[PDB]
Amino acid sequence: HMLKYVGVNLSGAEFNSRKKPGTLFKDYTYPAASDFSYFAGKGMNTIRLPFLWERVQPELNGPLDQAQLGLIKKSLEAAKANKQYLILDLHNYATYSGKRIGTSDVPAGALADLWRRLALEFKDDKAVIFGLMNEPNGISAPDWANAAQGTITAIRKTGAKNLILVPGTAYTGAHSWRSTSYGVSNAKALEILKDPGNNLAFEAHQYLDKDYSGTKPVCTSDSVGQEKLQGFTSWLRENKQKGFLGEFATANNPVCDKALEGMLTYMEKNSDVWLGWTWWAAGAWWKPDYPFTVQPGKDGSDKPQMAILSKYA
Ligand SMILES: OC[C@H]1O[C@@H](O[C@H]2[C@H](O)[C@@H](O)[C@H](O)O[C@@H]2CO)[C@H](O)[C@@H](O)[C@@H]1O
Numbered sequence: 001h002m003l004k005y006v007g008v009n010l011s012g013a014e015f016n017s018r019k020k021p022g023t024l025f026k027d028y029t030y031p032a033a034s035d036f037s038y039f040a041g042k043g044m045n046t047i048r049l050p051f052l053w054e055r056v057q058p059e060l061n062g063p064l065d066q067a068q069l070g071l072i073k074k075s076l077e078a079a080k081a082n083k084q085y086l087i088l089d090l091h092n093y094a095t096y097s098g099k100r101i102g103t104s105d106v107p108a109g110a111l112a113d114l115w116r117r118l119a120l121e122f123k124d125d126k127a128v129i130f131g132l133m134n135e136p137n138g139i140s141a142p143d144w145a146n147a148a149q150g151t152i153t154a155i156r157k158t159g160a161k162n163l164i165l166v167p168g169t170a171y172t173g174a175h176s177w178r179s180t181s182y183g184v185s186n187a188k189a190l191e192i193l194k195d196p197g198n199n200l201a202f203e204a205h206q207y208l209d210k211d212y213s214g215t216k217p218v219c220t221s222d223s224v225g226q227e228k229l230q231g232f233t234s235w236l237r238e239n240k241q242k243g244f245l246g247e248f249a250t251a252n253n254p255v256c257d258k259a260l261e262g263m264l265t266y267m268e269k270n271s272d273v274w275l276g277w278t279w280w281a282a283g284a285w286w287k288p289d290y291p292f293t294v295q296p297g298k299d300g301s302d303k304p305q306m307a308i309l310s311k312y313a
């Protein structure tokens with residue numbers, strides 16, 4: 001890999017998110033240790049690990065759930081054993097129990113408290129990367145930027161020097177990073193962020209279907225991926241920042257495979273600002289027909305997209 005961090009999302013701990021606490025192995029699962037070694041064997045040195053705020057912190061501003069923390073720590077042991085980095089992805093869409101950050105129910109400070117506590121747990125660990133929030137939306141760019149600043153500040157107050165991945169609002173889409181149609185863009189809002197620890201990257205996501213949701217197994221052209229990354233890439237360069245593609249995916253077809261090669265090549269060519277990427281997704285709980293799975297088969301066989309991902313790892 002020409003990029004520092006390449007790998008996959010191991011999805012499953014965030015499943016059935018309505019269920020709180022939910023029951024391990026019934027409503028959600030953590031990854032098998034064998035998942036980590038499989039992806040390591042393909043050249044991937046980074047795992048993004050979705051998990052739920054509600055499961056790790058059952059009451060806002062309250063203590064962390066020790067069982068949930070233990071599961072995260074067990075995944076960290078597996079990552080370290082396989083010489084991987086682990087992104088702790090608070091996979092929450094700027095909500096807690098269905099209520100948006102910024103409402104009276106969920107003040108921005110509550111997210112800062114969550115991250116204070118996780119930072120205290122993982123500060124002494126070079127393998128751990130802090131993924132502040134999966135796909136904030138339903139909150140303005142300046143309000144989200146304020147929430148993000150509070151969270152960065154809370155992490156740094158603990159002494160933690162770990163890399164922080166900071167998203168924008170609008171589902172942190174790379175394509176829409178500079179859009180001012182509806183008001184202030186992520187680009188403008190996030191210009192004012194300060195990290196006293198100087199170890200930040202901006203997390204964007206990019207899907208290649210008509211509305212960039214990853215709802216359909218279509219890539220709208222064989223070049224749309226790289227095209228949609230350009231504005232964000234320039235913004236990184238303009239601001240002397242780094243970026244991380246926290247989710248992206250393409251379906252198993254010729255146009256999509258061309259688009260995938262194009263976007264991976266594009267990030268390599270622009271590795272001055274792209275720190276890395278994590279494909280969506282692997283994990284043991286996807287159905288056989290899920291168009292973006294790279295979880296190896298029960299037969300041990302590689303999924304179609306893995307042959308391309310492995311080339312860039
Ligand atoms: O229906 C299967 C499973 O889906 C889970 O949500 C998935 C969703 O299917 C996928 O489109 C999206 O990209 O990822 C999420 C997981 O983060 C859902 O959590 C489960 O309740 C459901 O059984």
Ligand SMILES: OC[C@H]1O[C@@H](O[C@H]2[C@H](O)[C@@H](O)[C@H](O)O[C@@H]2CO)[C@H](O)[C@@H](O)[C@@H]1O
Binds near residue numbers: 207
């Ligand atoms: O990008 C993944 C994310 O997409 C969400 O859909 C958004 C889409 O990103 C955005 O470009 C479009 O304008 O609006 C839709 C929402 O209607 C999707 O809802 C998420 O589940 C998904 O993770």
